[PDB]
Amino acid sequence: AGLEQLLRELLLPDTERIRRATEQLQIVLRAPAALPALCDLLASAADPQIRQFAAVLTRRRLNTRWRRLAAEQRESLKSLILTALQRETEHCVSLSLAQLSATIFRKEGLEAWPQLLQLLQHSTHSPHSPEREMGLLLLSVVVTSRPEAFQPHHRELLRLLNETLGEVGSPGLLFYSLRTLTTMAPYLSTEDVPLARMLVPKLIMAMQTLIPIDEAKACEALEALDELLESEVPVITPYLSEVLTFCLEVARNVALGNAIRIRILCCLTFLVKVKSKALLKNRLLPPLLHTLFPIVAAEPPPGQLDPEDQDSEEEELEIELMGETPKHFAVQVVDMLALHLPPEKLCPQLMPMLEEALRSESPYQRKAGLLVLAVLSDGAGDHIRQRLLPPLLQIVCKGLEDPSQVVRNAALFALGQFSENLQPHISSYSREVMPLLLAYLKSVPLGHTHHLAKACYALENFVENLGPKVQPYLPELMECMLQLLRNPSSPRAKELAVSALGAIATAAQASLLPYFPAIMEHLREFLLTGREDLQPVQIQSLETLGVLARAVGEPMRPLAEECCQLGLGLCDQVDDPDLRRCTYSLFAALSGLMGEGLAPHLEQITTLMLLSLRSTEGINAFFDEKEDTCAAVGEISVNTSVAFLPYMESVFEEVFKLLECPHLNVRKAAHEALGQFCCALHKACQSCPSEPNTAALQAALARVVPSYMQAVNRERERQVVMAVLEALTGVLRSCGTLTLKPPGRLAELCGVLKAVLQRKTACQDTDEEEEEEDDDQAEYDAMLLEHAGEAIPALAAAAGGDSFAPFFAGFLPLLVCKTKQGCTVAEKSFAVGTLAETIQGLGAASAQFVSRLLPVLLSTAQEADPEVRSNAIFGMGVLAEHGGHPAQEHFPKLLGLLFPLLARERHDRVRDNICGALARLLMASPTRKPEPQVLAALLHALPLKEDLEEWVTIGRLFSFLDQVIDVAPELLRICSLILADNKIPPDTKAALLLLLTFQAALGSLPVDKAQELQAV
Amino acid sequence: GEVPTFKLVLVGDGGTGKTTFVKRHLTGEFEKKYIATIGVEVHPLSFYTNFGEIKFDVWDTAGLEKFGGLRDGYYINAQCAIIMFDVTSRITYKNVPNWHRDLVRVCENIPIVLCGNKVDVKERKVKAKTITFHRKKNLQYYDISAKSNYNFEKPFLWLARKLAGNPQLEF
């Protein structure tokens, strides 16, 4: 009102610094006493340029001023809004007034303003055009104001849409209508009349007109269309190919910004993930591939070199990961097209296009071929598993000889995703391609560390999974990295070389001996380093030396003598948890290997370890550093003598206080760190200390048990359930009856853990939803069941008839559900194994239970699986030497056991278990048995090539002189066939050698023993 | 008598490298002490292209300290803006859509390029697959280097493209 406008006319262009500092005096303190319109609206009649931000300030004020406003304050504002709607001169002014109307529609909700409805009817009729578009925009903004409040109006609005179907006119009207349906899309009706169509031709015409006008308008048109489909829309499904054909054929207009390609491809991808079964009916893929093939081999209109075509490319040293160019998001689009659908026969269908893609004379055709390999490379290779397992073993080689040298990088990348997507195919015809790849990669030391880094990432990665196979490859690989090892170059070259050295170290484990003295000098050179700019190389060398220590142990004593302080010394120069990563692992492994050898550097290392976890860093995430340090204490469980006895109290309690944290991974790390104190204290006590030490450590065990006990059912989660289960199993396996001192863990703990498994589980919940960010959550809980396989045996064989011994009966009926013919072979194997440890743990008390459960075992009988049920197959034997009188109850059941099935034997395991069980049955008592018959049969089929658990049967049957001699020639010929073999337990001593002295064996030598055993 | 005059307004939360950004575009140095940027200032900058030296306007808008709310005043008559975000915190990324809604309620279309500072740190929190909002909202993205001045002129070159639309505009 006067002075305000006078200020604005001068402050709009560039204002003033003093006028900028004025602010509150420029605001004129607001000073609202009543301020209806004179100092609250300024009559809203001036040059609109001021009026936009004047209305903005009115909005800001009224957002809070409505605490005493009178009734005669709303009709005035709405009437003024109507007048401004009639009084329009500029597009931005109309936009501002529409925004003000939408943002004043924030409250009072429905049941108000009939004049907006009358304007709605006027805009539906609206023979005049400009007022029609203004009506459309104001309806659009008011719909934007309230998302879905006017559900009954939706039909009306949909009916309104019919009028919008009738005018394919000004581009502004089309923009308004499509941005209206943009906000209409989140309504998610899915139930209205499916006859809602004719929008497709209108949007086609709109984007056609906007190609020469504006690319972005068609852009928002397409994300509007994408947002339209979110559920079972009844009208989109029948006719869908026409719109995608139109968008691709208009994408053939290369004279447009690449955003056109960006959002046509993203809209296509969302259309596919919504559904992709329509292509089953019609052959829509081949036109799509013909369309995208020029896209894959796109050529710049002026021939401008690509950003990947620069020879130097010395910029962005750290990391780039750009994908804005058409070729990249095109290849991810086609790759998700490939992976989303089931394999079926689409790959054989596109093979005829594949050899068409294989014509590679022009380099652009070569990138096209490498991209078709990139898309074909998928997680599932079942199609390539059976046809042409080495599909193109020389085309990848022909790509190496490329002057453009980008085909080489593309082939390197393709070999990459072959390595980390096709696991079985890493063991394939790679016997010759790998050395030539290494040779030509090391033949170009031009200094382009990008190609070297991608080569290191893509290569020497899958070979580590192959342990036995890499030994024949030991020599050549050295003269690869020695091409750049310890040579003057960038620190990137050094870190790449040392990372590759660690990779082959992992691949070769202890087979590094033949050439290792040549790595001694490199180790001495690189370990004796350090500079103000060589931090990452020193760190990576640190963890690769840790890997070396882990892989090879005792033969490294000359190497283990040093590194006790040299690596330790280089920590005080710079203080950084990043610099301290994995440093604890190396010295921890050194302590584990030495025993008492760390005595000189035993206290300072302890102080430096203490000053790592007290840091308040936390008190995909920045806290992960702590986890690394946490992992350190785990290694302490291996071998630390008793030096940690005063150290344990120094840390454990604080570690105790670390078991609680909102971060899940730090909680897992803390729990797994807790899981090793059992082993630490047990190994301390086994190394005989004084009795007061035993009492103190027993008290420590007693105080630490409840920390584990509280986690039996208090937890409400899934991911840490595994960790707690193996931790409890380990702590029970790391101790014995001394953990049985509190008479509450005997039955209450066992009952709680039994109730937790299967139904009544704390985690097995469905009522609650996931309002936070989700993850893969690929139903891990099922595997939890088989993980429970090690839960039962933990201290299971410690009762032997105690008060809590007949407790498994509580779990007995549920095991019946395991043996019902309604589960998988894995479930049966789990159940039979669990029953195996339960029966082997206990004796007669469990013997009567298993005797009553015998009909279940007979019902199981012989299933169709080479390795199932074997647990019970030797379980009958283990109960044959168990029980006692229960064994004597059922001799006829013990003998036989449907013996003829030895003719059915196909797998070694079942044969070995049958033989062992029958041996235990025969030797349970020196009584009558099948003797020559079943004995001769099991001797006949007795290779015993993989009986890595039942050497005890062979040892016990030896020299165990019921009948005597029996079928001597059979056992003699079998043992001669066995002959000297690989490493064997004490089984072989006194193997009836002295019993020869019998007479028939000497006279009738088995076939010919003199071939190898002339005398012995 | 230079004809091409273009006003540029920078937008972003206070203390998010905006002052450092503009001062580095002035001479190319970093000043150590941190001062909470307040008020607004103009830095007339002219850069060389195929059409010669072209002058541009700067608006050093910052400061959530003043009681009076004047943040919306600078948004009028502006034809271009640049948005910041920090790579070490989720708050900037979740505030990007708030900046989107306020800018769209300012104007229906303005050329905006997503830009994130403080990338010189060796450890990076906002991993690349998280950056997808701009693509699906049709926002272009450039990266800025706090040390090497990477994309020192090419974001402004993109701005020139959107100002003219003729692909012949070069250095």
Ligand SMILES: Nc1nc2c(ncn2[C@@H]2O[C@H](COP(=O)(O)OP(=O)(O)OP(=O)(O)O)[C@@H](O)[C@H]2O)c(=O)[nH]1
């Ligand atoms: N001290 C320092 N900080 C730098 C340098 N280069 C980039 N930075 C980053 O800039 C931040 C400095 O914080 P501030 O002084 O508040 O600068 P700002 O975050 O941009 O905030 P405003 O100044 O209001 O724009 C640090 O946290 C660094 O991450 C540098 O050379 N020295």
Ligand SMILES: [Mg+2]
């Ligand atoms: Mg700054």
